[PDB]
Design a protein around this ligand. Structure first.
Ligand SMILES: Nc1nc2c(ncn2[C@@H]2O[C@H](COP(=O)(O)OP(=O)(O)OP(=O)(O)O)[C@@H](O)[C@H]2O)c(=O)[nH]1
Ligand SMILES: Nc1ncnc2c1ncn2[C@@H]1O[C@H](COP(=O)(O)OP(=O)(O)CP(=O)(O)O)[C@@H](O)[C@H]1O
Ligand SMILES: Nc1cc(C(F)(F)F)c(-c2cc(N3CCCC3)nc(N3CCOCC3)n2)cn1
Ligand SMILES: Nc1nc2c(ncn2[C@@H]2O[C@H](COP(=O)(O)OP(=O)(O)O)[C@@H](O)[C@H]2O)c(=O)[nH]1
Ligand SMILES: [Ca+2]
Ligand SMILES: [Ca+2]
Ligand SMILES: [Ca+2]
Ligand SMILES: [Ca+2]
Ligand SMILES: [Mg+2]
Ligand SMILES: [Mg+2]
Ligand SMILES: [Mg+2]
Lengths: 54, 423, 331, 440
């Protein structure tokens, strides 16, 4: 059991205790996914309006 | 925020008027539209159902529709008749003769554009329209036929808004004409496609509650409608009063409807008593799950609950509530599907309805509702196999094939419920 | 009422417990996957302890201690005894054992072996030559000193083992069932050849299959405490309580107290109890040796009713009351 | 001095943010109108509290914070509440209608229409930073906005601030605290999408918060205010190191450096003590409160660390604590508790002490104590909460229950199973790190 890296200030202190040693999607790609979902919504709404028109 | 209320035909307008009497009293609105309450909780969400007119008056966001003037003359003379926007009465003179085809295809078609003009005016001054609630019966002609025509047109104009109905199902025990099963079978298919939530109010159940429980030897439509307006007030509490819930119509439908076609709910209410006695929380909880307090004449023990909302009102122990909700779930352990975790919602609102220290409204999405549709289907088939009374409809331009399809559609719906009852 | 689920359809003990619970009118059996239970009689393997104790309003009890396997697996028991300071590499009532992979102790085994009566048992193969034992394993195992000098019952010159049933409830009370069983070998003990397994293994199955005159001296090769104590009185001028049961109680307490911090469900969001089967050997000096601990034991047929009822009184109804056959091992 | 920007998303995020910024103002002596009498530098400074507060010429201390919700009623409480004067109007962003408990609605449908405005308002806070560290993101797993809009925002923040750290404070769903029935869906969908964008995430299970309020505070029916004031104490002890002089966890990077060896396994368990009812008390010792850090009933997520392995462990003390006492407590606990580390990690503790004791809201439910501690430990045991959540998902998804609401907003069914396979992989990661093989 050893205390290392002891730092003190007027606000408090910090230290470490060792007990044992061991043994991205681009902006375009996001906007594609969001636009794709929009188009799928638009397709489903269009089918609804076609059904209602019938 | 805002909800647009529509009420159509005789039943729809008589139940609608009582709903507005009940909730105006709850929000402190007198029959002149003047606010005279004593709690800011009454005004916090008044805008959901009321517009504020310039004179500090509150006016229901309500459209009253009929194909004959009689019932709407009765509403206007009624208790709260002066609160409604006079522009919002939309009526013809012909009537619909208890005939879905007249409501949906001939007489109703002549009037529907004028109703949509009023809907559009109300929607236009909505800061952010939640959606629409329609009250009607399914056994007549105007509420049934014109009402579902209205729902279809509203969906075309506002495809992304929620649509709810409070729908009165016919029963031969409380019947005006023999063609009611025809009108109701035609309407149900409309509702399967074009509502997000349908509160199924069965006139058989209402009569049996008035007769057996309330000890009303000779129930009247008014006695039936007292039950419905009390239930409607309870189901909409979470919209009308500041809870911690933060519920709107879409949230309600998302949480109650796991499959798009299975959106037909059994409502219930407690207490119903034939009274000054204190009702304890155990009694409230036990009553609201009793089949006898349910307003769709379906035995829930014959099916399984997909989802349940239980709304308690008044000042009571939340701790007692939860203990009883747990207890009643144990007693009904076999009657909840196990593949929707936590599918029973408990909600408490502190404002009691008038004349009760506490009450409870039950909303069940149960597969037992299939019994209601089977009942209608049998009555429909008993006549349709002999083509009886069909001339009333073919005389309006309908073909027999449209009856075949509506019957096939309802039997499909029944099979759908039976599929999930056995999952 | 009270609700329970059954997830081990192969448990003879909890088939009877469940059978008893239903016949009180105050318990209801739900489908196996219904989460809204009070009591889970769980599966032996992969029991989902992590899903217990999260149902609002429900007190939840399960018939297994998460972590008890450390005591109920052969290799684990050996590691637990050597590395627990309360048990220590020194502890006198456990035969010298070694964990051998086909953390491995192959080298310290041969050391003690060369230091030597040099008969060992891997687990089954009993041999006096190390080379035979290690080749057997490669074909995880423990090699244990084989008790070359057992206590032999007369008549018959016959080896036995003692099974003790222990119930640890949700408060970590340790309850030793009054009734134990001796499981006896029918064929006489033969130190000259360990090839013949039938008289060196007292397993009830091995006696029923391999031993002629099985059931010769006592029914089903099972002897109970009343007879055994009476034997120890007649033949050895001592009692079962003094010569044996004091050591048995000591050993049970040591094993279960050692692991209590790791498995206790006090202050946990769900509660555990568990029934254990302890197996002991007795050598000719009336010293008692722990052989193994069984986490899912069966019971002797004549003792099912009493013990399963005892489980209901002590472990289940103590948490879920309705509208002593055990010895409480204090600690 | 390096700045931190807080982002609060949805009702849970907004209401917790209110509780935190209230507590922050109390901890730093900032009045509701934004005035800080003790701050002798008017209109500027690079003090430690300036990581969370900017300054105007009138001497007002303004939270580096943005509030985002898809409906206005929660944030309207902010605009009219006690701390209304703290925030600029540009910081409080509301939409018209909410995500209706629907991830797909928060992420795709409504999210797409407000994401660019949110980013513009965050950019305005960022332009006022001499050296921005990154973001603290507060949200629920279960809400349509908290789940769906947060995951969209985290993606864009990785694009727009690639070199910046992002920490989460996430509310994990519990039926005791009003849930929607689809919260398992929303939780898995947002975890799958956010996982590669978050460096460290502190889950708070409403079940544990609720039970601490019932048991320690003796509040029969805890409110959101009760829960949120308790959550804000834990948040505040986690963020204290950014807002005060110190040497442990002084920037956001250090949270990852100290608590997260493997990137995907970035959910430390928080444990807090003592929680004492203000309506009462004997002052607990360093040894007693440190021991309490290994009691399951004081954890932010209920699970059993005795049946997992530690990868890292930070002890954050507030109040009257000296290092000697901490070592005497740890020596005691190590000989009494089941603290097993993974083999490729030092068995140790990083300790931070801040001498100021916890500040409590006057009139709140929490008593003022002389010393408290928050333990942050990365233990495999927290995977139990993933296992529970994934099981509820599996039950509903097998019947495709409620899926039509998500497909109706333009989400493909394949996003469900993709999200679930990712969670299955996550559960396997914890399993590989944390379990010794059991014998058949
Ligand atoms: N601890 C805590 N949990 C909250 C709070 N508000 C909501 N929750 C929890 O958050 C989840 C619901 O999500 P919300 O944050 O309310 O929803 P939202 O992000 O606003 O999304 P939508 O309203 O669906 O658009 C549930 O699990 C609630 O219990 C809060 O103030 N504190
Ligand atoms: N060290 C030892 N010395 C002598 N005999 C031993 C021994 N270890 C085991 N045995 C014998 O082997 C038999 C079975 O041993 P063990 O209990 O380890 O296997 P097992 O788990 O398959 C049977 P059970 O589960 O019913 O106890 C015991 O009845 C005992 O007679
Ligand atoms: N008329 C009503 C009223 C309510 C309400 F009062 F809000 F509880 C509800 C309901 C049901 C529900 N369920 C979740 C489990 C299955 C039923 N979840 C909710 N909410 C309300 C808003 O927060 C999310 C959950 N709401 C439904 N219909
Ligand atoms: N509960 C209730 N049912 C009614 C009322 N009026 C009519 N009904 C029922 O509604 C059906 C007749 O429809 P109705 O509304 O009168 O016809 P419409 O005017 O053409 O829509 C039958 O099932 C009647 O039993 C009423 O006031 N209350
Ligand atoms: Ca005409
Ligand atoms: Ca027109
Ligand atoms: Ca300054
Ligand atoms: Ca990044
Ligand atoms: Mg009529
Ligand atoms: Mg065994
Ligand atoms: Mg919200």
């Amino acid at each position: 059991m050893e205390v290392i890296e002891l730092n003190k200030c007027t606000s408090g202190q910090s230290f470490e205790v060792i007990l044992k040693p061991p043994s991205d999607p681009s902006l375009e790609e996001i906007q594609k996914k969001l636009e794709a979902a929009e188009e799928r919504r638009k397709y489903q709404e269009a089918e609804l309006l076609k059904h209602l028109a019938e | 925020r805002e909800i647009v209320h529509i009420q159509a035909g005789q039943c729809g307008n008589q139940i609608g008027a009582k709903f507005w009497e009940v909730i105006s009293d709850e929000h402190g609105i007198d029959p002149t539209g003047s606010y005279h309450g004593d709690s800011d909780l009454q005004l916090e969400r008044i805008n959901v159902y009321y517009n504020e007119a310039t004179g500090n008056k509150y006016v229901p966001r309500a459209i009253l529709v009929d194909l004959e003037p009689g019932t709407m003359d009765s509403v206007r003379s009624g208790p709260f008749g002066q609160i409604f926007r006079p522009d919002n009465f939309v009526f013809g003179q012909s009537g619909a003769g208890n005939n879905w085809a007249k409501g949906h295809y001939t007489e109703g078609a002549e009037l529907v554009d004028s109703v949509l003009d009023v809907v559009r005016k109300e929607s236009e001054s909505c800061d952010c329209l939640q959606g629409f609630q329609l009250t009607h019966s399914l056994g007549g002609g105007t509420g049934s036929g014109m009402g579902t025509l209205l729902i279809s047109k509203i969906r075309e104009e506002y495809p992304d808004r929620i649509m709810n109905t409070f729908s009165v199902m016919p029963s031969p025990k409380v019947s005006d004409t023999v063609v009611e099963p025809y009108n109701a079978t035609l309407s149900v298919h409309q509702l399967v496609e074009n509502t997000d939530e349908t509160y199924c109010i069965d006139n058989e159940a209402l009569y049996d509650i008035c007769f057996r429980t309330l000890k009303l030897t000779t129930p009247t439509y008014g006695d039936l409608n007292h039950l419905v307006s009390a239930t409607m007030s309870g189901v909409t509490t979470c919209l009308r009063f500041p809870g911690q819930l933060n519920a709107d119509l879409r949230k309600l439908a998302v949480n109650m409807v796991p499959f798009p076609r299975l959106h037909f709910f059994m409502p219930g209410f407690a207490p119903l008593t034939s009274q000054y006695r204190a009702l304890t929380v155990p009694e409230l909880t036990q009553q609201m799950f009793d089949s006898k307090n349910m307003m769709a004449a379906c035995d829930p023990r014959h099916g399984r609950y997909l989802t349940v909302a239980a709304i308690f009102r008044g000042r009571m122990s939340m701790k007692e509530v939860d203990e009883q909700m747990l207890n009643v779930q144990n007693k009904n352990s076999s009657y909840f599907v196990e593949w929707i975790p936590n599918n029973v919602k408990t909600a408490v609102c502190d404002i009691p309805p008038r004349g009760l220290k506490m009450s409870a409204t039950f909303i069940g999405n149960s597969t037992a509702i299939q019994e209601l549709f089977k009942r209608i289907s049998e009555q429909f088939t008993a006549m349709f196999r002999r083509k009886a009374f069909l001339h009333w409809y073919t005389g309006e331009g309908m073909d027999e094939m449209e009856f075949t399809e509506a019957e096939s559609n309802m039997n499909d719906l029944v099979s759908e419920y039976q599929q999930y009852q056995d999952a | 009422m009270y609700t329970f689920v059954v997830r081990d359809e192969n448990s003879s003990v909890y088939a009877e417990v469940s059978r008893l619970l239903l016949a009180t009118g105050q318990w209801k059996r739900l489908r196996k996957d219904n989460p809204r239970f009070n009591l889970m009689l769980g599966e032996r393997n992969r029991l989902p302890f992590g899903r217990l104790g999260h149902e609002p309003g429900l007190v939840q009890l399960v018939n297994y201690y998460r972590g008890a396997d450390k005591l109920c697996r052969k290799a684990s028991l050996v590691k637990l005894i050597k590395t627990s300071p309360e048990l220590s590499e020194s502890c006198t009532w456990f035969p010298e054992s070694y964990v051998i992979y086909p953390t491995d102790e192959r080298e310290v085994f041969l050391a003690a072996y060369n230091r030597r009566g040099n008969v060992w048992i891997a687990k089954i193969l009993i041999s006096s030559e190390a080379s035979e034992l290690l080749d057997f394993i490669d074909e995880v195992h423990v090699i244990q000193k084989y008790l070359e000098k057992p206590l032999l019952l007369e008549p018959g010159h016959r080896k036995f083992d003692i099974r003790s049933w222990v119930l640890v409830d949700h408060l970590y009370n340790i309850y030793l069932y009054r009734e134990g069983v001796l499981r006896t070998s029918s064929e006489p003990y033969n130190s000259a050849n360990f090839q013949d397994k039938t008289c060196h293994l007292t397993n009830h199955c091995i006696q029923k299959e391999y031993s002629k005159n099985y059931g010769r001296y006592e029914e089903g090769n099972e002897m109970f405490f009343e007879e055994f104590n009476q034997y120890l009185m007649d033949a050895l001028n001592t009692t079962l309580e003094n010569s044996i049961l004091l050591q048995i109680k000591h050993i049970i307490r040591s094993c279960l107290m050692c692991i209590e911090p790791a498995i206790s469900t006090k202050h946990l969001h769900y509660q555990s109890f568990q029934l254990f089967g302890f197996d002991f050997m007795v050598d000719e000096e009336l010293k008692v040796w722990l052989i193994e601990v069984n986490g899912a034991p069966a019971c002797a047929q004549k003792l099912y009713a009493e013990l399963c009822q005892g489980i209901v009184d002590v472990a289940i109804s103590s948490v879920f009351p309705l509208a002593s056959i055990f010895i409480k091992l204090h600690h | 001095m390096r700045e931190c920007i807080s982002i609060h998303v949805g009702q849970a995020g907004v209401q917790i943010g209110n509780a935190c910024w209230e507590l922050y103002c109390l901890e730093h002596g900032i009045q509701p109108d934004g005035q800080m009498p003790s701050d002798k530098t008017i209109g500027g400074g690079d003090d430690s509290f300036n990581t969370f507060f900017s300054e105007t010429g009138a001497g007002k201390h303004v939270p580096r914070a943005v509030f985002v919700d898809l409906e206005p009623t929660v944030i309207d409480e902010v605009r009219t509440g006690t701390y209304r004067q703290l925030f600029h109007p540009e910081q409080l962003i509301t939409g018209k209608e909410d995500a209706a408990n629907n991830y797909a609605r928060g992420h795709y449908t409504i999210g797409k229409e407000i994401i660019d405005l949110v980013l513009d308002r965050i950019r305005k806070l960022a332009d006022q930073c001499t050296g921005l560290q990154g973001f603290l993101v507060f949200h629920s797993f279960g809400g349509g906005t908290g789940s769906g809009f947060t995951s969209l925002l985290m993606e864009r923040l990785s694009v727009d601030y690639g070199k910046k750290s992002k920490l989460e404070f996430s509310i994990y769903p519990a039926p005791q605290v009003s849930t929607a029935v689809v919260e398992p869906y929303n939780s898995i969908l947002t975890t799958h999408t956010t996982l590669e964008h978050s460096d460290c995430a502190f889950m708070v299970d409403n079940e544990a918060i609720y039970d601490i309020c019932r048991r320690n505070l003796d509040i029969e029916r805890p409110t959101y205010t009760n829960l949120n004031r308790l959550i804000s104490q834990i948040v505040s002890s986690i963020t204290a190191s950014l807002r005060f002089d110190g040497a442990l966890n002084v920037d956001l990077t250090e949270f990852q450096t100290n608590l997260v060896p493997y990137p995907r396994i970035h959910f430390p368990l928080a444990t807090y003590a003592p929680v004492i009812s203000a309506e009462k008390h004997e002052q607990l010792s360093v040894a007693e409160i440190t021991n309490a850090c290994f009691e399951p009933a004081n954890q932010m997520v209920k699970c059993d660390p005795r049946h997992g392995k530690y990868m890292a462990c930070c002890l954050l003390y507030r109040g009257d604590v000296v290092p000697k006492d901490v070592n005497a407590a740890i020596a005691t606990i190590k000989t009494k508790r089941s603290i097993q580390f993974v083999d490729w990690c030092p068995t140790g503790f990083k300790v931070g002490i801040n001498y100021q004791p916890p500040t409590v809201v006057p009139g709140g439910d929490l008593a003022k104590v002389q010393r408290a501690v928050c333990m942050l430990s990365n233990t495999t045991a927290i995977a139990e909460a993933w296992a529970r959540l994934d099981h509820k998902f599996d039950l509903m998804y097998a019947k495709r229950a409620f899926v039509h609401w998500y497909v109706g907003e333009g989400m493909e069914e394949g996003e469900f199973s993709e999200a679930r396979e990712d969670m299955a992989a996550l559960e396997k990661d914890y399993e590989e790190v944390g379990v010794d093989s059991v014998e058949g």
